[PDB]
Amino acid sequence: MFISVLLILFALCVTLIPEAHYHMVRVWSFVATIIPMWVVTWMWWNFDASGHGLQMLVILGRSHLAFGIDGVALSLMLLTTVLFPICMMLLRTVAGFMTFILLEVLVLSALCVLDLLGFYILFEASLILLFLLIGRAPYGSLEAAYKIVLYTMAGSLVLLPTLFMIYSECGTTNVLYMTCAYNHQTVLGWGLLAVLAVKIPLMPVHLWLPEAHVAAPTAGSVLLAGVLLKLGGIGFLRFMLPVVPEFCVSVFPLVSTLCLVSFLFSTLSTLRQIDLKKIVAYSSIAHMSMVTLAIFSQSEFSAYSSSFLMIAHGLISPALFLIVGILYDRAHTKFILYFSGLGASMPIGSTLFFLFTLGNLAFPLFPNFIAEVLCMVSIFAVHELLAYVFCVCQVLGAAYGFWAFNRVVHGLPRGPADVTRTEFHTVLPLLIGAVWLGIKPMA
Amino acid sequence: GAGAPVKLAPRPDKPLPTWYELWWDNGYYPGQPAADFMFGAWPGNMTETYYLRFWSVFGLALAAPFYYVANFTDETRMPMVPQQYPAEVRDVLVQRRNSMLKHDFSAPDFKEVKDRAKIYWTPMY
Amino acid sequence: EPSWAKQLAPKSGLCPPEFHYNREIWYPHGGFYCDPKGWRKNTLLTLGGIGVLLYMTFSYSTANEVRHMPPKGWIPSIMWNSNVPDPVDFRGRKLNRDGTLPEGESS
Amino acid sequence: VFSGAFNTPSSTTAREPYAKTKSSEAEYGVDTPVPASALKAADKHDALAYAVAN
Amino acid sequence: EAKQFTPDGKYMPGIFSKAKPLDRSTQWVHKNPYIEAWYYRRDHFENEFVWNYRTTIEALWFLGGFTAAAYALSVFAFRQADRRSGYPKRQILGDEPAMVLPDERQFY
Amino acid sequence: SVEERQSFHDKVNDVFKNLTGEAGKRWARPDEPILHTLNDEKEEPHIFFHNTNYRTSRKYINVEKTKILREQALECVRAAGTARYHKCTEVMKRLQAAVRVASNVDRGPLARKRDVGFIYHNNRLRELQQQAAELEIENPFPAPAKQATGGY
Amino acid sequence: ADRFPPPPMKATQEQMDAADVPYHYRDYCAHMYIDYKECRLTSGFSWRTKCAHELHAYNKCEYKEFKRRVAIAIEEKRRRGLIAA
Amino acid sequence: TSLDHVFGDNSNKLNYNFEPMGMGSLFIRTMVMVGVFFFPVFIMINDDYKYTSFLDKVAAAKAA
Numbered sequence A: 001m002f003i004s005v006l007l008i009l010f011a012l013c014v015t016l017i018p019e020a021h022y023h024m025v026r027v028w029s030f031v032a033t034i035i036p037m038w039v040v041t042w043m044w045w046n047f048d049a050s051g052h053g054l055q056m057l058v059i060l061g062r063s064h065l066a067f068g069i070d071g072v073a074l075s076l077m078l079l080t081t082v083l084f085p086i087c088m089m090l091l092r093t094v095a096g097f098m099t100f101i102l103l104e105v106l107v108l109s110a111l112c113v114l115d116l117l118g119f120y121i122l123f124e125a126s127l128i129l130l131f132l133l134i135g136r137a138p139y140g141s142l143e144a145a146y147k148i149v150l151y152t153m154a155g156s157l158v159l160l161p162t163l164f165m166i167y168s169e170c171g172t173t174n175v176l177y178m179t180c181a182y183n184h185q186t187v188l189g190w191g192l193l194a195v196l197a198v199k200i201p202l203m204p205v206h207l208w209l210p211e212a213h214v215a216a217p218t219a220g221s222v223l224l225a226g227v228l229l230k231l232g233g234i235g236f237l238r239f240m241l242p243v244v245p246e247f248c249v250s251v252f253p254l255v256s257t258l259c260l261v262s263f264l265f266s267t268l269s270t271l272r273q274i275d276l277k278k279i280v281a282y283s284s285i286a287h288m289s290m291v292t293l294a295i296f297s298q299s300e301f302s303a304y305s306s307s308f309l310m311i312a313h314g315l316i317s318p319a320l321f322l323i324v325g326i327l328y329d330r331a332h333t334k335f336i337l338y339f340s341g342l343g344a345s346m347p348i349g350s351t352l353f354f355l356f357t358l359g360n361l362a363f364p365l366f367p368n369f370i371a372e373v374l375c376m377v378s379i380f381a382v383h384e385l386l387a388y389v390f391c392v393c394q395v396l397g398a399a400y401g402f403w404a405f406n407r408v409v410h411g412l413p414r415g416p417a418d419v420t421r422t423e424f425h426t427v428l429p430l431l432i433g434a435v436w437l438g439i440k441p442m443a
Numbered sequence B: 001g002a003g004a005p006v007k008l009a010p011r012p013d014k015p016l017p018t019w020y021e022l023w024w025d026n027g028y029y030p031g032q033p034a035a036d037f038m039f040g041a042w043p044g045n046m047t048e049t050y051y052l053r054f055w056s057v058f059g060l061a062l063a064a065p066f067y068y069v070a071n072f073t074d075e076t077r078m079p080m081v082p083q084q085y086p087a088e089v090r091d092v093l094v095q096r097r098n099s100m101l102k103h104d105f106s107a108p109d110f111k112e113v114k115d116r117a118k119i120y121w122t123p124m125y
Numbered sequence C: 001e002p003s004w005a006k007q008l009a010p011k012s013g014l015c016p017p018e019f020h021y022n023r024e025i026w027y028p029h030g031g032f033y034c035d036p037k038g039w040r041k042n043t044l045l046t047l048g049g050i051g052v053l054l055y056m057t058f059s060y061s062t063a064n065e066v067r068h069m070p071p072k073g074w075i076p077s078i079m080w081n082s083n084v085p086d087p088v089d090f091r092g093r094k095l096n097r098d099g100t101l102p103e104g105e106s107s
Numbered sequence D: 001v002f003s004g005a006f007n008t009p010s011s012t013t014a015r016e017p018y019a020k021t022k023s024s025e026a027e028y029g030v031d032t033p034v035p036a037s038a039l040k041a042a043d044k045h046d047a048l049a050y051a052v053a054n
Numbered sequence E: 001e002a003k004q005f006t007p008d009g010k011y012m013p014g015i016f017s018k019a020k021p022l023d024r025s026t027q028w029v030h031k032n033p034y035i036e037a038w039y040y041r042r043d044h045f046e047n048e049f050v051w052n053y054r055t056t057i058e059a060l061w062f063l064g065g066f067t068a069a070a071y072a073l074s075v076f077a078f079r080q081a082d083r084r085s086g087y088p089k090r091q092i093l094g095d096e097p098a099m100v101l102p103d104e105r106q107f108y
Numbered sequence F: 001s002v003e004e005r006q007s008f009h010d011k012v013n014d015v016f017k018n019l020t021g022e023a024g025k026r027w028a029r030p031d032e033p034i035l036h037t038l039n040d041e042k043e044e045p046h047i048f049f050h051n052t053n054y055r056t057s058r059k060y061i062n063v064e065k066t067k068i069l070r071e072q073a074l075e076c077v078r079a080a081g082t083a084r085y086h087k088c089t090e091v092m093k094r095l096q097a098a099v100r101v102a103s104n105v106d107r108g109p110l111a112r113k114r115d116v117g118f119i120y121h122n123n124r125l126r127e128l129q130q131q132a133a134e135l136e137i138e139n140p141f142p143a144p145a146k147q148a149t150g151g152y
Numbered sequence G: 001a002d003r004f005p006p007p008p009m010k011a012t013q014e015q016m017d018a019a020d021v022p023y024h025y026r027d028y029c030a031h032m033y034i035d036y037k038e039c040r041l042t043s044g045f046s047w048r049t050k051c052a053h054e055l056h057a058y059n060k061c062e063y064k065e066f067k068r069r070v071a072i073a074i075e076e077k078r079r080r081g082l083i084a085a
Numbered sequence H: 001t002s003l004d005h006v007f008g009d010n011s012n013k014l015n016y017n018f019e020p021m022g023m024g025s026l027f028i029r030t031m032v033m034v035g036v037f038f039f040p041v042f043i044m045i046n047d048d049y050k051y052t053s054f055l056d057k058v059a060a061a062k063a064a
């Protein structure tokens, strides 16, 4: 807590640096995100895996805002602290540095909060930052920014009275006493489903993602894909399943059909896309549908497998966004028809593209393979057909993945030259994390 | 011989069709459909009606003998019984539904072993 | 000619003289008709490193091989491995480590 | 509380229904009366009179 | 034939120089007008939606049809799981009061 | 009554307030659960968290039991060779029973009961054969198997 | 199979476990199979000439069993009426 | 155009209108695809029906 105050105050000192010292501004904003990565690694060192489920607790009196660490929050916090310095390497202005610093404060505090009102306050305080990040004046899109902000606001406004309903019902929004009291679970369950089915892209409230994740800059796309979608999953695992479990059983056919149609229809839409960033953007919806069904199965080790799929997606899809961002930065287009023969002109970039293509399709020696196997073990244990639907549709994911790769990488060599040292080192931590988590993830 | 000449494919100089992503233009001449034989003339000028018409006879010409022997012929056509085993060896060998020893019509539990070799799909509870 | 073109390798003697291939591109495997000058020395050194890896994996394999059944005769792994059990033949008789029947039924 | 193995509130339930909770020392309501027009307008047994009332 | 670096490093911008400097926009693509038009049209394809015959029929049989198929399959899987676990009929949303949430202190 | 429930809650709060433990023991890996006659154990939060920790301990121990038995069964089968059909049925049965306990105890609210031996299926086949005999019609089902796997 | 009863087994379970006889080869010629396998697996390239006797004896035993199987089938069909007697 | 006299020219154009398939053809082929690629669903539904009709026969002839 004292450490967190010191890290925030060190991060906020970027504004006071005079702008004529360019080197100092770059180094200060990069170190301001490097330090929380070290602190979260130390928190992993301090964790007792044979101890209590909630460790390193702190509660700030009668102000809500109570905090604690479990395994899902700790893995997601480690992933966020990895992803934020890479975002710092892709920005050039103090406005970008400050927006991403404020976003990192809000994400890190939202991932480990234990109060529902605290979760509401901390998460969607990032709405105006996302609006300004997506609708930036010369190269953004105001339509996309309006869509993402309005969908998130709609879901949050459905949740807010139900939050206050359980608060008047039992006397607290602390999740440890909300899980032990008697509450009207249908109303609160519908409010929580309303927020987290927009955060996780679940059809029909999913149309904001294709616009926002493409109109964003490369750093914004890395953040939005790798981090902000998983707040819906940790919302399911931390707040909704412990507090309204009767609802979570009774809504299972509806959540199940939403997940199945989201998976199938989003995979079918990904095949007709002609923009590389839109191809990468749609593929995330099917993965999150598998995550949601694995969470809702509650069957074998469902929290473990679903968290592991969230980590595998958060490693693999930001790297695909990084490669598309390199192509866009040095060729000024994201259109497939302008790219051919990238193997001959960018051999290192095409090799990285192929490896992350194989990772996104859940091939072995990548963490997505272990993730999808364990998620389908959790789904299979409820019924065999709910697993069969995901199993037989694997040709549809590989079709779009290999079609996009084969169209842009082979053929007549036209396009930009190979990657620089900076682009390679933006990609590199994700590759090392993927090789480790896909070969020896546990000990 | 690397470096052989190859003709390049022209760029679009007219308005594009709405569903243009069904043509694969890799840069060289000629391009192809996204999947072969989805449009354009088929090899030998055959059509789908040709293959469906020939298959509507040819498929029953191949499925005819299997049906005849599976419904009008049985284990007793053979001039000998299956391979004989001691009881302790046989009793585990015929536990497999896969085994060819269930066609032993001279076994004292021939019917019961055949009734246990019925394929099921959903495991009951 | 550009300034940096003098720093580049020529097209090798393996490459056909009329083939053009953009010599500025760094290929991770070597590229178009790679033929470095000191290749025989590098080949010998890489063969030495491969021999080091061969010895390391031979030792690791010998340390971690588990035989749940004794062999039915002499096997060549008896020469370098001391965890190989004594052979027991097809009739169940215990044998020597060189694969011959012990005294009492030999010759 | 939070483990990757299972979710304990998903299987920790009451075995019997509960009794009614006593909330106050006085258990009678106080409210203003409904006007008779709305009392009549709620009745659905006569479809014509329901339509005429609404 | 530009010179953007001194012999000891030290990048030079070449703002007033005659020779064209190599920079970030050196390999930007030359835009084909028809490709840009087609991508713009596909970007705004929601203006081309119309409730004609084919749109209504395909939105009924495929979208609503497969959504109903997936709901029926989900209910089938739920009921079969409850039967193969020793449970009675369980209360889904809109199904009258029944059993939800098995007790861990109970043998089924 | 309400007074007795309140006095029990006060006693539980006092006990869990003045609780300590040392010498190599982790709290939240308790040796025994707290035995109660409460309707809905979540009425008392300390008892609910204590029994949650005990139940987590048991789930992980059962997983470990499955791994130890799988190593033992592998040793038996690989030593036996072609004699494995009559030599290692008992250890295979014990491994399958341990997997059954590891899956079916504290299973969650939705997963079906896992039969590692096809034992529920063949038990059902036995009962359906017996019912069809009294019904005096032909059995539409397969006859029950004596053993389906290398264990059961 | 009462008219043509099986011969006694000349190989015990322990002998077939010691030779690692595959369980579908543990029939009424298993001892000859043990002899043939023991000869062939230790004779190398020239197994067809120096293990000719063991293979010939094993095939002769299997011929006896084949003839008994034909006779069992003939008796079963005669009892069912499929072949006139 | 320097190789058009060697490999052919660009005068002959592709004869395809890039139009969607007919509605009935699409519906029929999709129904065939659902039947072929989702055959475990139909197998298990048939299993449930054959099981519940036997229990109907048992409950009918038992209480008489």
Ligand SMILES: CCCCCCCCCCCCCCCCCC(=O)O[C@@H](COC(=O)CCCCCCCCCCCCCCC)COP(=O)(O)OCC[N+](C)(C)C
Binding pocket: A044, A047, A048, A049, A050, A051, A052, A053, A070, A071, A072, A074, A075, A076, A078, A079, A082, A303, A304, A307, A308, A311, A428, A429, A430, A432, A433, A434, A437, A441, A442, A443, D001, D002, D003, D004, F056
């Ligand atoms: C719900 C459980 C959490 C599992 C989430 C999945 C994690 C993804 C990767 C799997 C790694 C498994 C690690 C196992 C041993 C590590 C310590 C451990 O035990 O895990 C911790 C938590 O583990 C972690 O935090 C793992 C961190 C994984 C995140 C890795 C991604 C970030 C790295 C990015 C790439 C960096 C490259 C940099 C190099 C250039 C606690 O989990 P449980 O054992 O379930 O807790 C016990 C429960 N109870 C206390 C109640 C008894």
